[PDB]
Design a protein around this ligand. Sequence first.
Ligand code: HEM
Ligand SMILES: [Cl-]
Length: 401
Amino acid sequence: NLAPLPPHVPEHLVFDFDMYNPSNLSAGVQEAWAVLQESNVPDLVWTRCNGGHWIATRGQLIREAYEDYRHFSSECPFIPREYDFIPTSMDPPEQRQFRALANQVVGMPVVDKLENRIQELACSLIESLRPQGQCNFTEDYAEPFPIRIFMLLAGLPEEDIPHLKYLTDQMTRPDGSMTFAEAKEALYDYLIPIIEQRRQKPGTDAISIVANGQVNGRPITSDEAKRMCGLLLVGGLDTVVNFLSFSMEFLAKSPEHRQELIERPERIPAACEELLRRFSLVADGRILTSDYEFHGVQLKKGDQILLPQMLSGLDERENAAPMHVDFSRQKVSHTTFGHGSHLCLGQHLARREIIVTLKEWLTRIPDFSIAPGAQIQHKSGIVSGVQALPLVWDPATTKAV
Ligand code: HEM
Ligand SMILES: [Cl-]
């Protein structure tokens, strides 16, 4: 599965890293990707895996490339080359209109509005789990929490959750029932009638807002609205599900860090930021719009380049002892939510989900562990993650509140 080396790529830059199967995976995903930052590895390498593509390995180049959309286009953001969500695949200027609209639905003011709804949802999930003394965290909290948040955001009935969870799962873990493109249309078929109706009788919900939106001085098309609404759903799922899982896996394994946040709950927002750095999980890419010499390396029009958001915060040049989790770091440097014009619109909503999760969980279930005998398995990709997270606790050490 190595693609033949293109003639413009010098051999000395070749490191065959497989973003879907890194060799050090059993050590943890972030550790597995950090091999790219060992001192014998150049700032910019070519891998022959996954069709062949560049990888920027250090924070400086990752940031620079994300800033320079004129050379590094979002028209093809996934490796391999072989997905019509908006605004993911748009560059400025087209991107800014759609981004402005989506910001109306998940922006800081909306997050401030839903804050206690978000807390009530977390409390309800946690309280239902608390007496069991155990859960499949990824299944029982990490997924229900953001999907329930979406149903609130989008004004959608609870009965639709199982079917919506299934459709979104088909894009990450397919059953074999249908192609990826079929899962997409199924989702769109769910969304179109809701969009069309709320054009006519708008609510205060995200679908209403997007549906009644304007681009190019005219009403948004149903095609545009469906592709945007689709991103608002999937965008806040896989990342959140997997990030909360990494964070809870770490806390389950580190009673000292649990204790710190229990004793000092005011450090939880700072803890959130440090977890976002240490357990960063996205690795998107760009495509070269033209021939371009970049830090002494000749890139060719059409080359793909993976720019792992994950790696900037792990780079020792950005944070000392980057593998060490320290909630009091004076400066937490990362690009966990990206960088440049596509920087996560959900960043404020995600931080609140994380903070609320940490606070409510540590309040009700302060002492918890990985299930005895369980070895946590991870997966690597565009959004890296946790396959499952079995947790246990003693319900006599918990409290309802
Ligand atoms: C831990 C949680 C999250 C992480 C790590 C994360 C990460 C990212 C990253 C790296 C990007 C930019 C991708 C690129 O430049 O190619 C992005 C974009 C985006 N995210 Fe998130 N995200 C998270 C949560 C959310 C949530 C909760 C939502 C709510 C729906 C959301 C909605 C979006 C949207 C709409 C974009 C597209 C922005 C654009 O293309 O202009 N994200 N996210
Ligand atoms: Cl699980």
